[PDB]
């Protein structure tokens, strides 16, 4: 599944 | 060797408010799911039949991840517009891709992740999976920001555990197709150009996976002193096709042979005309 957390740039 | 990878894309629209966002997932060369906010159903949907037998918990959970992500990207978008002193009048693109790969031992091999703005490498997760790397003197801030927040930490978690665990599940739920190899249908075609030259075109159709090799050889020797090759393309039914041509002096046709390598073949194949 797609990662549960993305990145805040 | 197998892999599970996604490709997220976000595109700003000045006039149309909220930025376009799309996610697609793949296992090896097969797309299996996807999300698009401009679709009638702004939610995660299957793209492969072998997914259909999944519970609503799955689709709901995934739809969330996707939605949250679209938001963060919306932010990241404005954030970046800042870093570069750009106007809300132009359009911009932010892309993110990540994947985990399994080795022959059917165990973790490598993982990756990286962002890119307006088609240019921006930020990147390092091999060790514990540090980031600005790849644009602008990404600098974003680098430390992430290194302080320790974002790198769980990305590694996902990649190392979650990603793998699920990859396996997917392989099972889709063995029939995923693990099924489909060798290429071969053949050569003759196309006269001038009175002294013709064209030999080695074809390869309906194969899978996409990795393949075509090579033209004369009397045992090697060749490409007129070997035009086209980028492997999709058939549209899940399989691919590709061809390699070469110009030969008429009457010498027998001299040349096309070699074809593909995992679906017990051993390579040679054609002639």
């Amino acid at each position: 599944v797609m990662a549960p957390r993305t990145v805040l740039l | 060797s197998h892999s599970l990878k996604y490709f997220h894309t976000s595109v700003s629209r000045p006039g149309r408010g909220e930025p376009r966002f799309i996610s697609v997932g793949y296992v090896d060369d097969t797309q299996f799911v996807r999300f698009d906010n401009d679709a009638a159903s702004p939610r995660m949907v299957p793209r492969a039949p072998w997914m259909e037998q999944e519970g609503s918990e799955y689709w709901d959970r995934e739809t969330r991840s996707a939605r949250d992500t679209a938001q963060i990207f919306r932010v990241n978008l404005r954030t970046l517009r800042g870093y570069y002193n750009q106007s809300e009048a132009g359009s911009h693109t932010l892309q993110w891709m990540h994947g985990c790969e399994l080795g022959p031992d059917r165990r973790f091999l490598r993982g990756y992740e990286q962002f890119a703005y307006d088609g240019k490498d921006y930020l990147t997760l390092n091999e060790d999976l514990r540090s980031w790397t600005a790849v644009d003197t602008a990404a600098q801030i974003s680098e430390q920001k992430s290194n302080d927040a320790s974002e790198a930490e769980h990305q590694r978690a996902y990649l190392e555990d979650t990603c793998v665990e699920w990859l396996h599940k997917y392989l099972e739920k889709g063995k029939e197709t995923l693990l099924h190899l489909e060798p290429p249908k071969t053949h050569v075609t003759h196309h006269p150009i001038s009175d002294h030259e013709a064209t030999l075109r080695c074809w390869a159709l309906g194969f899978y996976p996409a990795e393949i090799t075509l090579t033209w050889q004369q009397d045992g020797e090697g060749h490409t002193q007129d070997t035009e090759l086209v980028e492997t393309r999709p058939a549209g039914d899940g399989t691919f096709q590709k061809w390699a041509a070469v110009v030969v002096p008429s009457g010498e046709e027998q001299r040349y042979t096309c070699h074809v390598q593909h995992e679906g073949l017990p051993e390579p194949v040679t054609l002639r005309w």
Binding site: - | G119, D121, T189, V230, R233, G236
Partner: protein, 100 residues
């Protein structure tokens, strides 16, 4: 900001044989940005009801899409793909050659 010219390829799912139903494909790739216009043509006429794959890209960040429709070849009918992109000075048209 980086731009990349799309690479076009017009072809059929199976080898062409007149009177036999098939599928016409226009495969565009290696382009950036994503806004792009693709049109399938039949003797100059713009064919309608044409589907296309979901947007995606490759390791070098460039996109690729697949437009396609169902069709039945004929020795008289002529088919082509018409593509327009910002990197293009003017819409490029490449016609189908059943031999490629």
């Amino acid at each position: 900001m980086i731009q990349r010219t799309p690479k076009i390829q017009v072809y059929s799912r199976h080898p062409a044989e007149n009177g036999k139903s098939n599928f016409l494909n226009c495969y565009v790739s290696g382009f950036h940005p994503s806004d792009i216009e693709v049109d399938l043509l039949k003797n100059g006429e713009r064919i309608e009801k044409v589907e296309h794959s979901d947007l995606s890209f490759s390791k070098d960040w460039s996109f690729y899409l697949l437009y396609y429709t169902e069709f039945t070849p004929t020795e008289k009918d002529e088919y082509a793909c018409r593509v327009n992109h910002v990197t293009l000075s003017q819409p490029k048209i490449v016609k189908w050659d059943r031999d490629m």
